Amino acid sequence: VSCLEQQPRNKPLKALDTRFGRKLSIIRGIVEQEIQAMVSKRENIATHHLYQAWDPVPSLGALISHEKLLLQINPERELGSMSYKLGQVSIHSVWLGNSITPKHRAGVDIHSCSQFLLELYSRWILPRTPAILISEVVRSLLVVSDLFTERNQFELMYVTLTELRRVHPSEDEILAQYLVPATCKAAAVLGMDKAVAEPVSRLLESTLRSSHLPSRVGALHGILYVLECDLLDDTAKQLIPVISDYLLSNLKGIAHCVNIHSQQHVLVMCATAFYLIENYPLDVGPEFSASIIQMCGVMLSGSEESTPSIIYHCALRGLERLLLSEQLSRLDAESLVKLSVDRVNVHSPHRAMAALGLMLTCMYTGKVIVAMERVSVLFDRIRKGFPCEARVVARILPQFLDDFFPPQDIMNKVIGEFLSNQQPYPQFMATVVYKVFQTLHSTGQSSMVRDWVMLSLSNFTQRAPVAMATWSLSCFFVSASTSPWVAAILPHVISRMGKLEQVDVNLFCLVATDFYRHQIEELDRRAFQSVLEVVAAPGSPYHRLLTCLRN
Amino acid sequence: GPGEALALTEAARLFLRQERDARQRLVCPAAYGEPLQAAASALGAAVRLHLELGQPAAAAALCLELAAALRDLGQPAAAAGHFQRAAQLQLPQLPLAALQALGEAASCQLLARDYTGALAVFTRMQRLAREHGSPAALGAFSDVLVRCEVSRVLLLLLLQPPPAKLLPEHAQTLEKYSWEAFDSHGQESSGQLPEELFLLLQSLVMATHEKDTEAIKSLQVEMWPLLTAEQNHLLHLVLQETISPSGQGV
Amino acid sequence: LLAANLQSSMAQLPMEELNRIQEYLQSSGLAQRHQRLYSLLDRFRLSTMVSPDKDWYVHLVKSQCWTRSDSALLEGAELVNRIPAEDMNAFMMNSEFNLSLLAPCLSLGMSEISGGQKSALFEAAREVTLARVSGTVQQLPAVHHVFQPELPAEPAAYWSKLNDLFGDAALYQSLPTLARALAQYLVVVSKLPSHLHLPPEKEKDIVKFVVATLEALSWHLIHEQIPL
């Protein structure tokens, strides 16, 4: 039934509470639900049901819904991976949940367990004790401290580990990878006062040079713990420069060829950079932000082979948070919009669906013809995407049109992209035409529907197969209708797209009749029969309908 | 040189046995993959070494061992990448070995639900199998063509590419199972597939043209004995995407 | 037969056989599957001599959704979503309703519940699912015996009754159809509002139904082949 608790390091975004932020949550929530279905590891879902994504994040309590964690899960976690990672619970959550700031899980007394284990492990690594066992005991402390709940547990751990650091040999490897993040986690819960900060900075700075790659990855999780603190200026002016030089050195080299390199190293380095740019924007160097955004762009602009899928989604979801965070300088934010549009136009449905999410957050963060160059990317992705992409692009499109354009500027494109012989999915476009016309009827703007129906009726009678011309007009007259019981039938029209039985002709006659009874003056009432008469050959649906109108 | 490479294979397999104990034999919830990170770094240095020593087939062996490990340890996307690196290192000198490696990459992409990626690896295999194995193929390459044909047709019925992504090779494959004109029977077999499996594939491709879901349900139980379990998973996804389409949010 | 001389073709295909073939192609629906053939047969006979209101919409939706089919279920769920809430329950509880719509209806209705609003469709589909689950459990033998593929050891009292219940076609096809709907409800039931959690009077019927469904699937393996 269950998987391990997560308490992520990143707070809820305030941008999503704004008027346009609320509108972004609906549209980017549609795209999120489809990225989850397509690339989630599904590790906590047993059954096939596509839309059952949840995260083990309780209200610091009951679970917070996946909708309300939108860009909150830690960047270095693979999508849907519920396995234990170094970083499960943030220091702000240890503080807020335990009422410490610088015991029973499900009836079980976990205070008794964690107290007993601190007593054993401290006496067993500080006696003459087997070296094969010390690292496994310190692994146990690093893990079990997610259960610790009183400050004296972290004090006892910090003292024990900082003694073990001077007791154990300086040539170590298999211990250091646990000792560094365990010491930093303890030190971070203890608040990084000068009594602890200088020892911890010296351990972090020196262990970033370690040849063993897990000792570097452990140092980077140590850094991610200590960066949650309200650091003192004399630590921030010395520690932050060492991290930023280490990040710019190791990312800038590998970014063109990521798959040659260990995935957890690239993922943890990105997570540090995103937390630095969001939370330390004044303290990190002037080339930072800009240079990170460029070399993350070089990862996203890779191939399906050179940039692995989990690193593609990490880097993208990180950049996407940095832009809804208000903290970018405008030249960095505008550079990220330029990086987004070049990655929607790609082969793979999931890589394009993610790049669409990024484009949407850019466009709702920016709130005059330049929006039209963006909408033509959405229409192109309906034309050239697989059905599983194009059906999603068609569901978001009505709101994107209504939020960025006056209807008149896109009404030409909406009807043309439904009529085009180069449209593979006219049954997806039918619901777009419907939602655009029913929006105009809701805003009292019903005259614009009389106009655009009659202005385009002769393009519809030029559809090449008569089944596809009798259809399409049935969608159009359903989409134009003011009667609610007619406007309800669109799914029955869409399910019959290829058909031309007597009921498909009768429906076309009825729905064209009711528009002619209730929405069409004599000059229109005649011109409608004139455009119809051109195709009213003795057996055609148009002849059968001309008899119903002419009587 | 070869002794240093050997020692790195043993030192990698040590961390990889240690990972298998924690992950597969103990099923430990606290098994974050520090030994796997050490194994992937160790083989990264050793693949660099075997390629500087100019022997691609010995580097490809490390890539197959790591790819198999990542698949067993529940990371099929990372496995599919290492199987394609093995295939690329084998292909200039051992075409059947490269086809075997691409077949495992395609199985890993299917485990990872990356169906458009699996479709592209099966097309690469069917090309390479005609290019090195030929219109009749030799028996080993013929078994690869037979896998690729059946897998590609089910993947194309699952994904249904638009005209913009219906490649010449996809259109050419599908038309064998389809009708060109209103009085055409559909094409006769070239003898590639058993006649019974070929008639059931033509029936399936035709039932998806005429939207006959009762026929697809009947053909699913009838084809079950004839398919591999991987192909029975593909055919399950075709019947599932037929009855409950993805991308609607319902 | 059209290209040949009529006096030979009228002897090859008598009018009584032409009329038998014509009636059969209509009654089987094969006329609509093979329209060119039926058109050629009726040619051979010639050669051998509204207001769209609520209740119209309900008649339209009935023509799609009171069937047996699996062809357009997401579109069918949207059509019953526009039937009025006071008509919905009686529309779904009728014998002629398509039980394949219930999972689509629960999935569509849940997307309204997760949008912050009441779903009449979800309420009707949940009640109909639970009522049908209880209604088929009432047909099981009153004392349950363990399913054992090797030995139907209790013949008259029990295994004869299961051999009549499973393999009926009409009942057996209903069980995994209902189980698709029951599973669509059980995967959401923890996310739902408090009044839409599982009724405590239904919990035994649900366990009896789940057991009977794996027993029916096992019975189908033994007497036929791999289930769908």
């Binding site: 197969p465 008569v466 089944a467 031309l500 | 249904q160 | -």
Partner: peptide, 17 residues
């Protein structure tokens, strides 16, 4: 009969019979 749609390879449309 049915015939292939020209706008999509997987879509088919009716023609009068």
């Amino acid at each position: 009969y049915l015939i292939r749609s020209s706008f999509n390879w997987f879509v088919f449309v009716e023609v009068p019979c």
